[model samples]
Target chain A: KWQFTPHQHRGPAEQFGENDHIYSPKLHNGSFKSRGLATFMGAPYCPPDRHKIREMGAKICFLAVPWDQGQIVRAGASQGAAALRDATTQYFPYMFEYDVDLLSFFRVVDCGDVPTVPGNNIKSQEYTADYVTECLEGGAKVILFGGDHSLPIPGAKALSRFTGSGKMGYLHVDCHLDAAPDWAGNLITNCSGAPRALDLPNCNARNMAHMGSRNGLNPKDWWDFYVDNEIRVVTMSEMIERGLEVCANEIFERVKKDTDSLYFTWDTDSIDISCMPGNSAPECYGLKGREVIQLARIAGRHGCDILDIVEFCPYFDPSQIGAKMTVNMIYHYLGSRAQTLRQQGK
Target chain B: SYAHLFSPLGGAPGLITFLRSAHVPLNAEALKACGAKYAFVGVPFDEGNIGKPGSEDAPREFRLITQEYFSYWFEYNVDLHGKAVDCGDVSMPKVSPEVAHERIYRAVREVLKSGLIPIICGGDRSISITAARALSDHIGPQKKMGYMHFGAQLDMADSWAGERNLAPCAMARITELPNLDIRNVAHLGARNAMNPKDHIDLSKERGLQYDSMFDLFDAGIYPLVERSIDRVWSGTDAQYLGFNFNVMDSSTAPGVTSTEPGGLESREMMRIVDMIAKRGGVSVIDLTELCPIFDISGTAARLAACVIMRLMASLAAQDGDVIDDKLRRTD
Candidate 1:
């Protein structure tokens, strides 16, 4: 179905709005020079500043996990990071009516996608975990983007490394609990089945919280396992009934009490298909855009410090709804929280 | 109030009820009552938005947004609860502006036979030529039908040189339409960004009424729009309301192609829509030139959605529906 259209290349001048007042980089003697290398300059969201954030106060760093190999239902979510990087420039200088030279703040970079063990999904989980630890040791904030939901195992490992010698609890936004053991002795830590497995070895499940979950596709045994482990599961219906802000308050109050630092992983399918449908797996009934935005705002505001966005499929989104929603969610999360952080001077 | 106080309103109870948000999804009988069945029609084609690549995306986006807020409540009672299908975007294949205009003209003429009010969303302002023709042809031979532009660019040559289906030059073509009296046109929200000399020449050559954003905001959109509404609807039976998002300030509405640094915000845009709605003379209402490409975080889509929602709300507030009828309107 890939129809090859001839590439009519338009040089720099043919691009409309390319040289607009937006993203006008600083000039040195009337000539704009390249700055230090760190995060990739993506559109729709601001590229991170290396010196100020990294050298001064980056307690953690962003680690992107662009992997979708384990995605059985929908494929190509591996392209989320690259696509988002291409489209975040349209919303510049207009955050909350405040002009923010966004690049001047934070330490973020595309540490590239997680290097899986070449189709070996199990060892890839371990590789992911090791990378997360490396980022944490470097004293940078790890805001990772996922190839699949499995990327969180590595994120949890980063927490273990940061805190050193122990496992920390997790705060997750996913359509499914991902609790089943490796099916048929495959032993590969399936992206959707490894989170609960975290408790068996290096991670703790006692303080784990999975909100916006209302999946009917997974076996009922998975639900029992989540409850048996005393892991907090906030159903989409409950979240809807409670209202996002109220639900957020409930999460902040409970999760903060149990863990010093919570790992935040957002699965795009957690949102309803009406708002966004292009993803690895889309749940029929899910949270609204406003609800997701509110949830992100709450997480960012309350210090859901280690945040990663995973499982976005650009090819499936013909209208670009999925990517746009992801960008907006990121914006509200960081934008609202950034405002709060600046106000408190934190 | 003078004889000019009348606002144009159309369609039967079931159809207009949902169109105005006076009701939700229509009953079985009411569903059949909607659309180009016994009224006039109009299309607004302004595709001058820089972010969106093609004008074809406008209709699809509009329909999707319309579905998003069918029964969603707001300050306005606007909801097209399955009432009327605004006969969507006109099909144009050749990419020639003149041919595109002719295609729209032909399409509207068909809708006109059924006597339904043709409501159009244009790819660019120039597409208004067809809408102007429909008013002159259907309404009367000698009746002076007036035209109004929310964001009118006076310089036809400068605006048309770079782009073929240019937005600004469309109004210039409108002035040339033999059936439409150039003197009766009212260009509201004409701002300081417009070349002053070109502005003077436009008024001198065409004798069109000109109003700036400062003037519109200062005097209030209602009374000023009322005057324009009166001028357009006085001698004619129908009038087309063409609103370009360009009238809005660039910062407030970056999704538009021809964005000015500062102009009307959402509140102001609503007031202008209200000016047309309250008059009841807007036989055809056009929501045009929404570019999702420039819609940072779906802001443009959200704005366009809210505007259409309000328009439907205005229609509903004017109705008196039974509770069962209301339930049916939402289905």
Candidate 2:
């Protein structure tokens, strides 16, 4: 999460040094900013090693896909995950709103960034799926921060294959429907996550839903996919027209009710640019910060198998507004899940 | 009207002032005429910048969001709507740090002389040097001035590549003020590799009373912050409050020239401000390193605005600059 630990602090010319200042998680967890092991939410770094992760008792694995070749435009999606991790230090692991110590409750572990090959995304996608599958194999739920909206293509595939018989629901909270069969003849680009998700054997249209859809980015084909597939889409206007909480809760209810597992992809473009302009695609008149916080809270109550946030490019954000809030979406999600389980005596 | 492209100053949307408040001229006459206790001055000079560019746009972006917030603060039971006037941005000659400082010094001098606290929104940390100098000069050499700076870096470089006015040497320049006593001046949130050994050496050499994030958490922040507040507020005719948002964690305040991790949380900052606000008044408050383009959701601006507005509200409450008693709502 921190850039570099300083040479003076670098652990005596070795890895995990007490003096090390880089973004390594091997450093001592002393109470200093930028010092210590900086991981997602200040969690311990469990190497992507499955046995080691399971040994560490990790329940939620944070895997960052710094892939951007999936996008036809905007390459900074690669920087999204680091910024996401960077935002967590300011917040305490204990969220007062949910009354949960997410660290203790979730046993979350940082798997660091998914290793991806440059100039080729197919290999990267394969590795993305591989890392995610490894984390899931280690018996942990995964929360992904993306390079672009394209991550969930491989992402959902991993989850789908993992849960062979468990019917899964996919929720796409984005400004664009992302239901295209192909974008510029590319089958697995940023515009094709939903189309790929439909290919998952365990996922069905009846259990699929998209919310926060607005603007002109949705092509006729994208709309037709939702229409023909009978996937419910809640537009920005529709959510506002009804009550936000009621609408958000209904989709969470729908996804969780009929499915054994849920994979949710919330594109940052779904939020109002005034509140989060650091996203891959900035859209005006989308959900506000308050509304997204609500959406995350609602999602938490549902507790998905995978909570994936995409298209958060920190360089696009100069104010640090989107960086922190993007992290909060998942934090609130996990926080609420802990709360829901507690209230129910889980 | 194609006014939607504008910054929402008024009906025309041509440009905005702080919180869409009345745009007063940068003179004592027009400022005093506005009947506001505070004068909001925009110092859009990034010539002495150290980090990413685009902070020159901080003043403009900061202005666009204030109207989005209510000047009324519930915690302080104070409303600050008409208590501050926006004097717009100081004219910049561009590039020359010394000249920019001269202009900044003059503008703040005018606002202080006009009998209104200047809420300075800056381009970078360097913006505070001249303003701090101006605050000392305005108070005259007889009165002791206290400065309490909040930043992640020590910022005590004598010169970076022989450049005197760069952001790295801000504190060094400000500390050069002969009238500002070392006992009264304090610094907090010094942290990260960003502060070189030289900076720490210089800070210690100058006997700057500072608290790093290490010591801050070691002993607890509140009492340490409380002590700094006491130091800054003790027996000083005037005080300069310098804010470098980098003093906050990188995630907490990413909209700066430098985003340092391992810093103060928002609530920690809130308490510090509350303590300062409870003291009734601050002579000059300057916020620096707010790069809005780097921000995601205006969070950096929101936090900065919150601290500024909260302090204003509390100070108002202290002075009984409150709304009439008729305003009340029962739960």
Name the top DockQ candidate.
Answer: 2
lDDT of 2 by residue, B1-331 (tens): 3222223455456558787688889999888878999999998888776455778888888888887876666677677767898988999896576777788889999999899999999888888888998898899988999899898777787776456777878888888899988888888887533554456567778898888765686678888888888888889988899898878765557677666544677888888887887777889989988887766567787888877877788788888877655544431
lDDT of each: 0.55, 0.78
Clash totals for all models, in order? 65, 23
lDDT of 1 by residue, B176-214 (tens): 766577656677765422222333455567676667654
Q: Which window of 10 residues has the lowest lDDT sum in candidate 2 chain B?
A: B1-10
Per-residue lDDT of B142 in model 2: 87
* TM-score of candidate 1 on Cα atoms, chains taken together: 0.57
* Reference-based TM-score, model 2: 0.57
Worst 10 residues of 1 chain B by lDDT: B1-10
Enumerate the candidates' DockQ scores in order. 0.06, 0.09
Off by over 4 Å in 2: A1-37, B1-331
